[PDB]
Every structure is written in structure tokens, then in C-alpha cells.
Amino acid sequence: LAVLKLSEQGVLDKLKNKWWYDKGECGAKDSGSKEKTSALSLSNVAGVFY
Amino acid sequence: PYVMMKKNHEMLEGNERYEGYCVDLAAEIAKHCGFKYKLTIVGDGKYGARDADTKIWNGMVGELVYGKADIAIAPLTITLVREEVIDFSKPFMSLGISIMIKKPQKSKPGVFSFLDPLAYEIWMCIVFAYIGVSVVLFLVSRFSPYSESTNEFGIFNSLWFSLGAFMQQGCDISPRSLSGRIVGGVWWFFTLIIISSYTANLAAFLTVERMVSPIESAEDLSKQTEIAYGTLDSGSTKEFFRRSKIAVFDKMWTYMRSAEPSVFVRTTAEGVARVRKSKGKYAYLLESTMNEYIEQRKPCDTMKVGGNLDSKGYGIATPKGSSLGTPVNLAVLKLSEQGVLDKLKNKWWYDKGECGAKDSGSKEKTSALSLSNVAGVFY
Amino acid sequence: LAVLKLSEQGVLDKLKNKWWYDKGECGAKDSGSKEKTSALSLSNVAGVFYILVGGLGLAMLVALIEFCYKSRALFDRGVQMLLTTVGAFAAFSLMTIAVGTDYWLYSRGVCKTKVMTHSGLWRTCCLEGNFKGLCKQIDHFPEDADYEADTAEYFLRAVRASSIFPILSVILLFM
Amino acid sequence: VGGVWWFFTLIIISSYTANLAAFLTVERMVSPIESAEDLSKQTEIAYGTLDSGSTKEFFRRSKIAVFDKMWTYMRSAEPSVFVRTTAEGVARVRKSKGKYAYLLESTMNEYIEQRKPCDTMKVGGNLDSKGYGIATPKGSSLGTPVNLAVLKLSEQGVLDKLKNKWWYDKGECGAKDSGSKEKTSALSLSNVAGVFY
Amino acid sequence: KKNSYSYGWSFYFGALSFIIAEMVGVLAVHMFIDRHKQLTG
Ligand SMILES: NS(=O)(=O)c1cc2c(cc1Cl)N[C@H]([C@H]1C[C@H]3C=C[C@@H]1C3)NS2(=O)=O
Ligand SMILES: NS(=O)(=O)c1cc2c(cc1Cl)N[C@H]([C@H]1C[C@H]3C=C[C@@H]1C3)NS2(=O)=O
Ligand SMILES: NS(=O)(=O)c1cc2c(cc1Cl)N[C@H]([C@H]1C[C@H]3C=C[C@@H]1C3)NS2(=O)=O
């Protein structure tokens, strides 16, 4: 009864989000979209401006 | 093409009526065994099997078991329930389940296929914008009395400046007024985008045409839901997908179960007609040597792809314990090593063929952008 | 015990990835593999035709007013030198306002020195946080073993860090 | 004349740049340079059989005009294409850079392709047909349980199961294994070296 | 990511600092035209 009580009150949600992430601080999904490099951005051709 | 009859079959009498692959195969055995063979079509007209409703054999094997048949030189696949009741020799011809698909139509580019990376609505709006710029470029440069003789831009020059600007060759005259450089400058940005889009779209056509692959395996048939596939509704091919453990054929089975157009057809020639109707959207699963002969018949628009997903064999059958079984078995091994089974194969499937084989050949035949692609520009 | 038996033998996973998938009539997994060509329609390049006709009407308009101004009818060193001076400190104002300002970039970030983040050239701060108006000024951020595996971008980060180029814009404009 | 010729060179040079962009992107494989018949025509492409074996007896005992050309060509052939062992014959292919081919059983050819140094291909189908078979003596008291068992394994798929497992999963390298990867290539000087010449 | 970086008003005023300094520069050249004209003409 205690396990079913902790899950519906989001305690198992809260204890998950705390221990895996606050003792984390590495970045998550920093790449993101694969089409971020679709537009040929300035860092690709900044040498021509140099 | 195993056993057929000629069109003058009523004119002839007996064994001379019949022609076919098994007919000559019966002829080659009697030369090596020494028996008097009489060809007989089964009166039932079915392959041998057993139905346990009355536990009675039917067809050719039924004539073998009961006593009507002395030998069954036929497309009779060597199985287990047939082997228990009647003898087989070693198989004389090898085959398996393969795929029959409508052959892709012959690639014929139009003479104006170079205009194809842009739409016809675009080339019509380029020529319309060509006229609109050149007239504006004429109206601007000769707008003022104050000068008029200094400007070299008539109409006949202004159509030429917008022509050299679009084909990017550059023209000898250039605008000198402020508003003359506006109409000249914007059209230069227009011809930068359109010509660069035309080239990159043409690179996108030639890349994908170099990437589009045929279907050359049964798993490759399974991974794509564009082309549909069906078997006989009653046959050993249908049994094979059920009795196999492999998950590729099991999902090919459940696909045939649950596809909302039913893929099963009643016989083979109904399945052949379904290949012709769907315009290259329908695949057909059947035996290989049936698949080799059908693509060699007119209208020649089917083809063999891939390979044998299983293996079977056609065998010469004798009744169980009969005396003929061993000298037939020596005759089958004698015909194979002398290349007679090689010769009788190459004759019946190809000389009664004359459809073309591997006419496409290499996929890199269209690598070099040949003259038929851009012959319209020369026109 | 039977439920735990089906999962260890894989049956609950077997009965699921069979049922949802094989009895699934359509899917992105089913249709994703095909790829065919596309000719460019007019709407792909329709804006270039819009700028073109906009460039035509703009050409005819200034051709009209340059004509009328000549028919009806700025050249002196005096007020031109004075307008240059007015343009001089204006460029000196717009750059010197810009450098000290922390509103170069609107972004997302954390400012708590260990969220509508406004970051800047010499001072990067935060806005719409837990509390507004706090600044975390950062340069030469710690990388793999003090970055030393690469040589190129450290000179490019130090030009961002020790930002001489906006300052040398100001100093040449001051001289 | 100047107007239409400009529309000519616009189409051609844009098609030249487009077709390079298709080549350098899509690395379609070399077209497999022979087949069954094409090995007989290209006489600069040598091909060798075993000096005493089943493949040697087949080409002399042939009434087909293609194979009769093949037995004629290897008869008056220099250097000698008859090999002692298969390990010598497989080695003569990899050192001759496609000029020498090898005629062998389909079972060995699929196995050599899966072994290291991985540099072979099986082109074309079988020229003849042969079969390995479980052998019992004359007058066997167990031949009939054997051949029923062989037909049982094929209907249950076991002979096909024991093959496409064994040759493939115990296959260390393969064209099927390595074919999917695709990375970029900068142009070297030898790609455009003729334009400098 | 869906990168939400946008340029604040300080960035564009430096760009407006650029274009005016390009305009003050060419007007300074235009005045350097004229001071040579009184020197020689
Ligand atoms: N060319 S073919 O496919 O008709 C074909 C098919 C076959 C041939 C020979 C030829 Cl040429 N012989 C093989 C061999 C296996 C045993 C039965 C016959 C020989 C010994 N059987 S087969 O697989 O039935
Ligand atoms: N992925 S699924 O829905 O097919 C699925 C989901 C589950 C399965 C098995 C499968 Cl196949 N078993 C687990 C069970 C195994 C042990 C851990 C949780 C229970 C007891 N329950 S679950 O986590 O609800
Ligand atoms: N493709 S294979 O080599 O795995 C393979 C080859 C063969 C198999 C089964 C398999 Cl799995 N069985 C057949 C057998 C079935 C009947 C037809 C020929 C014999 C009797 N022999 S075969 O044609 O030599």
C-alpha cells in the first residue's frame, strides 16, 4: 500500500528527478535538432570574412 | 513447358502428340533404361496430395499408389508425405520460391527533359519577367529629354542586356543612371537565385536517380509497403510461410493475413494477370522455374528478381518397391553429368523464349549524362 | 507467477511488438524508407518574383521624381562640415552606448555564479529568473584539460574574452 | 546566334556541375566486370581451374559453345592456369588485381568471401549443378530413416536454418556487413590532375 | 535545439554605428576632394 501511495503523489516522480538530475549537471540533448546545421551558419565561412 | 501438346494434336496419335521438357526427359530415360513409355495425362488433373476427410490420395501420386501409373515424370515436388508412399529418385531440376514483379518500363527521357528541374509555370514566368524588365529598362533610360543621345539603351539593346544578365555571360553595355541600375541590379539578384536553384535541383534529380535501388530480396520486399505481394490461395507456397520459424516470413505471413486488399489469388494465371494490372505495384510469389518461363513469354513485361528464398526440387516418381526405381535412379545421374539436363534446360526455357534478359544491365549506364538527355538543347 | 513467467520468456513483449505492429495497418516505420524526386514549384521561388516586380515599380518611381526635380529646378563645405560633426559624435554615441550595454543578445541562461537571459559584450546578466538584476560575467570557460588539445579557437575565444575589436572600434572613432 | 548559344552553355555547364554532385555523393559500386559469359569473352581476364578435379572434367565434357570456348582458351593459355591446391589458386586471384579469376564450388566461394582478407566476390550463378549427400552403404538398414530425415529438415527449414545461420553469423567479414557506411571524400590532386596537364 | 537566441537593441545600434561611420567616412573623402580643389584650382 505504501508503494502505491508514493507513486500517485508523485513522490517517486520527485525522488527520481532529484537524484538523477541534481547530482547530474551534465548537459542533456545539447545537440537538439539535426537541422541546426541546415542553414550554413557564420562559423562555417567566417574565415573568408577574415 | 513441362508437357504440352501441339496445335495439330488431333492430327497426331499417341506419344507423338505431346511435346515438352518431361516428354524429352521420358525419351532420354528409355534410351538409357530400355522400356516402352506411353504418355498419359492424369484424368483428375491435379498434383498428388492426401486429404484426410476420406484418407484418399488424389492426382498423379494417387495413380502411382493405386496402380494406374508405372512412373510419374512430372513437376512433382519431392516431399515427405509423398516419399513415404511412393519413391523418388534424386531431383532432376532445382528451384525455389521466388518473386515475379512487373519489369520497370524502359527509361525514355523526353527531348525537353532539361527543362524538368523547374516547372512549366516557372519558365513561363521567367520569359514574362524577361519582357517586363526590358521594357521598364527601356522606359527608364529614355524617360527624359534631358541625356537622350547619351544613353545607348534602346528597346533592342534593353532586351539584349536582360538576356546577357539571365544567362550570366554579361553584356558590354551597363546602365549609368541611378534608376537604370535599380532595374539592372534587381534582375541580377533574380538571375542569381533562379540559375542556382536550377543547378541544385538538377543535382537533386541525378542524386536520387543514382540512389533508387531495385527490390532484390524477400526482406527487401518486407521492409517496404509500397509494393504488395500475394501467393496462391491453395499451394505449398502458402504452407511454407506458416511452417517456417523465421520472423521475416512470419511477418510476411501476417501481412498476407491482414492486408485489407486480399493478396491471395485462386490460381497462377490469375496472379499473372494481377501483375499486369497494377503497373509495377504488385509482386508475386511463386516457384522459380515457373517464374523463369513466364518472363520468357510475350508481352515479356515481367522479370525475375532476387534469389530463391527456399529450395525445392522436382523429382521422377515411381511406386513404392517397384523394380523401375533403381535403373531410373541410375538414369537421372547419367543424364546430369553428360549435361543433358543442362541441354534440355537451356533449350526449352530459352528457345521458346526470345524475350530479352538483363537488357538494363549496369545501373551506372546512366552515370554519364548521355546525349539523349540533352538532345533538345541541340535542337 | 504466470505474469512474471511471460515476461522472462518474453511473451508479454512478444504479444505486444507482434500485435501493435503486425496488425498495424499504417505507420511512419512503414512509409519512411521511400524517397522520390520533386520538381520546384512556383511557390518555392515566388518571393524572388515579388522582389523583382517590387524592384521594377521602385525603378520607375525614382525615375519619375528625378525627372520632375530637374524640370522644377547641399553643395557647400560649411554645413557639410557641421553635419559631419553631428554625424561624428552620433557614431561615437551609438557605439559607446552599445559596448557598456548588456543587451547584445536575448537568450536563455543561468546567472547565479554557481529565463529571458540578456547577455552582453563585457557584462552578461539575467532577466526573468528567480530574482532579476544579477550578473554572471564569464570568459575562457573550462574545457578538456584547460582546452590545450586545440590551438585555433582559443585565440578566437580570447578575442571574444579580451574584446579588443569593439574597443578598437571606439578608440579609432575617438582618435 | 549569340542569344541561343548562351542558353546552350547555361544548360550544359549546369548539367556538368550537377552530375559531379551526383557522383561525389552517391558512391555506386564498380559494375561487376564479368558474368558467366563475360569471363569467356574478355580474354585479357584470365581464369583458372583445378588441375585434377570435378571442375576440370566438366569443361572438357561440355557440348555448350560458351564452355567449349572456355576449355579451348585455358588449353592454349599462358601462364599456366592449372593450380595445385585451392589455397594457391585463391592467392593467385588477390595478387593479380582482377586479371585472374578462379572457378570453384559455390560452397567454397561463399566461404572464402566471408573469411579474411575479405577481398573476393561471387559473381554469377552456378554453371553446373551438384549436390552433397548423406551417404549410407549398399544394403543399408538405416538409409530409409536417413532420407526421410533429410526431407524433414528442409520442410521444417533446418537445412536452410543451419546454413544461413552458420555461413553468416560465423562470418567474420562481408560486403553485407560493411556496405551501409558512407562518409565524405575531399578531392585529391589525382582527380583533377589532367586539367593541370 | 530550438535555439531561442535573438539580438537585442544594443547589437543593432552598433550596426547603426557602423553605417553612419561609413557615411561620415565617405563624406570626409568628399571633403578631401574639395580641399584639394581650392588648393589647385
Ligand atoms: N540446370 S538444373 O537446375 O536443371 C539442374 C538441377 C539439378 C542437377 C543438374 C542440373 Cl543441370 N543435378 C543435381 C544433382 C543432385 C543429385 C540429383 C541430381 C544430381 C545428383 N540435382 S538438381 O539440383 O535437381
Ligand atoms: N514493454 S511492454 O509493455 O511490452 C512490458 C511491460 C512490462 C513487462 C513486460 C512487458 Cl513485455 N513486465 C513488467 C513486470 C516484470 C517485473 C517488473 C515489473 C513487472 C514485474 N511489468 S511492465 O513493466 O509493465
Ligand atoms: N539452399 S541450401 O543449400 O540450404 C538447401 C539445399 C537443398 C535442400 C535444402 C536446403 Cl536448406 N534440400 C533439397 C532436398 C529437398 C528435395 C529436393 C531436393 C532434395 C529433396 N536438396 S538441395 O536442393 O540440395
Side-chain angles (χ1 to χ4, degrees):
Chain A
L1 291 171
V3 176
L4 270 300
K5 187 180 287 185
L6 290 175
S7 181
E8 58 90 16
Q9 293 179 359
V11 178
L12 296 174
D13 292 329
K14 185 176 91 275
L15 293 173
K16 182 182 176 67
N17 288 320
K18 196 267 297 296
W19 285 100
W20 275 266
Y21 293 98
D22 297 334
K23 279 79 178 175
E25 65 84 30
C26 302
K29 295 188 288 184
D30 294 332
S31 65
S33 178
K34 301 286 102 174
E35 288 180 352
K36 62 179 182 179
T37 184
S38 287
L40 198 38
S41 67
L42 191 274
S43 67
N44 300 112
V45 291
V48 185
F49 288 87
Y50 294 161
Chain B
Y2 297 99
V3 167
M4 297 180 290
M5 300 181 76
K6 293 182 286 293
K7 80 282 290 178
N8 52 3
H9 60 90
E10 291 181 353
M11 292 177 71
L12 295 173
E13 182 180 2
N15 289 319
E16 290 85 3
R17 300 176 295 173
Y18 294 92
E19 63 176 358
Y21 177 72
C22 294
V23 177
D24 289 332
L25 183 59
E28 292 293 329
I29 295 168
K31 291 173 71 174
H32 292 173
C33 181
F35 61 95
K36 181 66 176 66
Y37 64 96
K38 190 261 184 180
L39 300 176
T40 300
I41 304 298
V42 55
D44 292 330
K46 283 93 173 66
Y47 295 102
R50 183 181 60 83
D51 48 349
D53 51 353
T54 58
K55 295 180 180 292
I56 297 298
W57 294 94
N58 58 3
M60 299 184 288
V61 176
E63 293 184 353
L64 289 168
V65 173
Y66 294 161
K68 301 293 187 293
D70 289 329
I71 196 167
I73 298 172
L76 193 64
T77 307
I78 301 172
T79 59
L80 186 66
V81 294
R82 291 174 184 176
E83 177 64 25
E84 189 178 3
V85 292
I86 45 92
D87 288 326
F88 287 103
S89 70
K90 279 90 178 66
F92 61 94
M93 188 177 71
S94 176
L95 49 96
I97 300 172
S98 64
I99 301 169
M100 184 173 73
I101 196 165
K102 178 179 281 187
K103 186 183 288 185
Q105 295 300 110
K106 273 72 65 180
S107 176
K108 299 293 184 180
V111 294
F112 293 158
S113 66
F114 63 97
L115 294 173
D116 196 73
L118 297 176
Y120 66 97
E121 67 198 9
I122 294 172
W123 295 104
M124 176 265 293
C125 286
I126 290 169
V127 178
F128 282 171
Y130 174 76
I131 306 300
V133 168
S134 65
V135 171
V136 166
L137 196 146
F138 171 68
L139 187 142
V140 165
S141 297
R142 302 292 181 88
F143 186 74
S144 178
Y146 293 97
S147 67
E148 194 269 331
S149 179
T150 63
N151 287 318
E152 194 175 1
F153 293 98
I155 171 169
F156 185 66
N157 289 317
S158 177
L159 271 72
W160 183 253
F161 179 75
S162 179
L163 196 277
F166 182 74
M167 283 74 168
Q168 293 179 355
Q169 297 292 319
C171 185
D172 184 73
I173 60 177
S174 68
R176 292 179 180 88
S177 70
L178 180 270
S179 175
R181 296 188 201 275
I182 300 299
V183 55
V186 176
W187 179 259
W188 283 357
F189 182 71
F190 178 77
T191 187
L192 186 61
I193 305 301
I194 295 299
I195 301 303
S196 178
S197 69
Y198 175 75
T199 304
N201 197 9
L202 181 56
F205 282 182
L206 299 181
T207 303
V208 175
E209 290 180 357
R210 192 171 167 88
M211 278 183 177
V212 170
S213 297
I215 299 299
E216 294 293 330
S217 74
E219 184 180 2
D220 200 4
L221 183 63
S222 178
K223 290 172 71 176
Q224 54 90 33
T225 62
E226 179 177 357
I227 300 169
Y229 52 89
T231 69
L232 282 77
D233 59 348
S234 67
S236 65
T237 299
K238 186 183 75 70
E239 181 69 28
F240 180 74
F241 294 99
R242 287 184 285 113
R243 73 175 189 267
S244 295
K245 68 100 184 176
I246 184 167
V248 178
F249 292 165
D250 291 331
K251 67 181 72 175
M252 284 176 67
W253 174 253
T254 311
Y255 182 79
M256 292 188 287
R257 292 287 88 187
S258 66
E260 182 68 28
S262 69
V263 299
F264 291 98
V265 294
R266 304 280 83 84
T267 55
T268 63
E270 182 174 358
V272 174
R274 187 173 177 177
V275 175
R276 308 295 185 86
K277 184 67 180 293
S278 298
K279 293 187 186 295
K281 295 297 293 294
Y282 182 68
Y284 185 73
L285 295 172
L286 81 167
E287 303 296 328
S288 178
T289 57
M290 289 301 295
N291 196 5
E292 287 177 350
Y293 177 70
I294 291 302
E295 62 90 19
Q296 290 298 111
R297 300 294 293 163
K298 289 183 180 178
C300 306
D301 56 348
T302 61
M303 64 179 291
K304 179 177 173 66
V305 299
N308 292 318
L309 55 90
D310 60 347
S311 176
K312 293 184 186 293
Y314 288 168
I316 296 164
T318 57
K320 182 68 71 177
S322 179
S323 178
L324 289 174
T326 302
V328 165
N329 207 171
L330 291 171
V332 176
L333 270 300
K334 187 180 287 185
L335 290 175
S336 181
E337 58 90 16
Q338 293 179 359
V340 178
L341 296 174
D342 292 329
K343 185 176 90 275
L344 293 173
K345 182 182 176 67
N346 288 320
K347 196 266 297 296
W348 285 100
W349 275 266
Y350 293 98
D351 297 334
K352 279 79 178 175
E354 65 84 30
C355 302
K358 295 188 288 184
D359 293 332
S360 65
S362 178
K363 301 286 102 174
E364 288 180 352
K365 62 179 182 179
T366 184
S367 287
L369 198 38
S370 67
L371 191 274
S372 67
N373 300 112
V374 291
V377 185
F378 288 87
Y379 294 161
Chain C
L1 291 170
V3 178
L4 295 174
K5 187 180 263 77
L6 296 176
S7 181
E8 290 186 355
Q9 299 294 323
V11 180
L12 292 169
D13 204 359
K14 182 175 74 71
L15 288 172
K16 186 174 171 184
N17 61 6
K18 181 260 290 181
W19 186 264
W20 273 259
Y21 293 161
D22 295 331
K23 299 293 183 69
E25 55 187 357
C26 68
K29 184 174 72 176
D30 296 332
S31 298
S33 295
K34 68 179 184 292
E35 190 178 5
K36 68 184 180 182
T37 65
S38 177
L40 287 175
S41 178
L42 185 60
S43 66
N44 298 113
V45 293
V48 192
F49 289 93
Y50 289 163
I51 300 172
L52 181 60
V53 182
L56 291 175
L58 181 61
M60 302 174 76
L61 182 62
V62 190
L64 191 147
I65 66 168
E66 184 70 30
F67 176 72
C68 293
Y69 184 76
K70 288 175 69 175
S71 295
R72 293 179 182 179
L74 194 35
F75 291 96
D76 50 355
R77 59 93 55 81
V79 298
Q80 179 181 359
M81 184 179 72
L82 183 60
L83 186 62
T84 304
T85 58
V86 174
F89 66 89
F92 184 77
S93 296
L94 292 174
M95 194 66 204
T96 51
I97 286 170
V99 173
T101 302
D102 54 352
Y103 292 105
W104 288 88
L105 184 73
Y106 290 164
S107 64
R108 298 285 185 267
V110 184
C111 68
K112 285 175 92 286
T113 70
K114 183 254 179 65
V115 178
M116 294 298 291
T117 295
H118 62 283
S119 65
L121 195 288
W122 285 109
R123 51 181 292 164
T124 163
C125 304
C126 64
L127 194 282
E128 190 62 27
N130 49 357
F131 61 96
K132 295 175 175 66
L134 201 277
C135 299
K136 186 261 291 179
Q137 299 179 1
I138 195 66
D139 54 351
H140 59 88
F141 63 97
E143 195 60 25
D144 296 329
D146 203 2
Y147 184 72
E148 59 89 22
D150 290 328
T151 62
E153 298 291 327
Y154 180 73
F155 181 72
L156 272 303
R157 292 296 186 273
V159 172
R160 181 182 64 85
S162 66
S163 298
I164 185 168
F165 284 160
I167 291 174
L168 194 65
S169 176
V170 174
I171 296 301
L172 266 299
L173 192 60
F174 180 73
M175 293 184 288
Chain D
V1 178
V4 180
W5 177 253
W6 283 350
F7 184 74
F8 180 81
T9 66
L10 182 60
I11 298 301
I12 296 300
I13 303 301
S14 297
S15 67
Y16 181 81
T17 305
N19 202 2
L20 280 172
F23 285 173
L24 302 174
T25 300
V26 189
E27 198 66 37
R28 181 64 65 194
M29 192 179 173
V30 171
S31 297
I33 54 167
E34 291 91 15
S35 70
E37 295 181 356
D38 291 333
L39 187 59
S40 65
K41 277 93 173 68
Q42 282 74 240
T43 58
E44 66 180 0
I45 307 300
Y47 53 93
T49 61
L50 193 64
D51 56 354
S52 66
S54 62
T55 64
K56 184 263 296 177
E57 294 290 327
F58 181 74
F59 291 112
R60 55 177 62 191
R61 193 183 292 273
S62 178
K63 273 76 69 178
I64 301 167
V66 179
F67 299 100
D68 201 1
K69 185 176 180 180
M70 293 174 71
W71 180 252
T72 303
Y73 180 74
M74 293 184 286
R75 193 267 309 277
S76 66
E78 291 297 326
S80 180
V81 297
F82 290 162
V83 296
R84 300 284 86 82
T85 183
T86 177
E88 198 273 334
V90 171
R92 291 181 71 186
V93 179
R94 62 184 66 179
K95 66 100 177 178
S96 179
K97 280 79 175 176
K99 302 285 104 175
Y100 184 78
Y102 189 64
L103 294 175
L104 77 162
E105 308 294 329
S106 176
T107 57
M108 188 60 69
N109 197 2
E110 291 178 351
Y111 179 74
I112 293 295
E113 186 177 1
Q114 295 301 110
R115 296 295 93 191
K116 290 184 182 183
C118 308
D119 51 353
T120 55
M121 289 299 291
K122 179 178 182 294
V123 290
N126 294 319
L127 298 179
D128 55 354
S129 176
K130 285 181 260 72
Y132 287 156
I134 295 172
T136 62
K138 181 182 281 186
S140 177
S141 298
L142 56 93
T144 310
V146 162
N147 59 3
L148 291 170
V150 178
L151 295 174
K152 187 180 263 77
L153 296 176
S154 181
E155 290 186 355
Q156 299 294 323
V158 180
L159 292 169
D160 204 359
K161 182 175 74 71
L162 288 172
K163 186 174 171 184
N164 61 6
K165 181 260 290 181
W166 186 264
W167 273 259
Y168 293 161
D169 295 331
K170 299 292 183 69
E172 55 187 357
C173 68
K176 184 174 72 176
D177 296 332
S178 298
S180 295
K181 68 179 184 292
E182 190 178 5
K183 68 184 180 182
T184 64
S185 177
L187 287 175
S188 178
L189 185 60
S190 66
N191 298 113
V192 293
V195 192
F196 289 93
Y197 289 163
Chain E
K1 296 186 287 183
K2 185 182 285 184
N3 289 318
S4 297
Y5 64 97
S6 295
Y7 290 96
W9 58 270
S10 178
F11 179 74
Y12 293 99
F13 286 171
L16 292 174
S17 175
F18 172 72
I19 303 167
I20 298 298
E22 298 295 323
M23 185 178 287
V24 170
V26 296
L27 267 295
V29 175
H30 288 174
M31 289 183 286
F32 185 71
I33 302 301
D34 289 329
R35 269 68 166 176
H36 183 76
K37 257 56 185 298
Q38 293 101 26
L39 183 65
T40 58

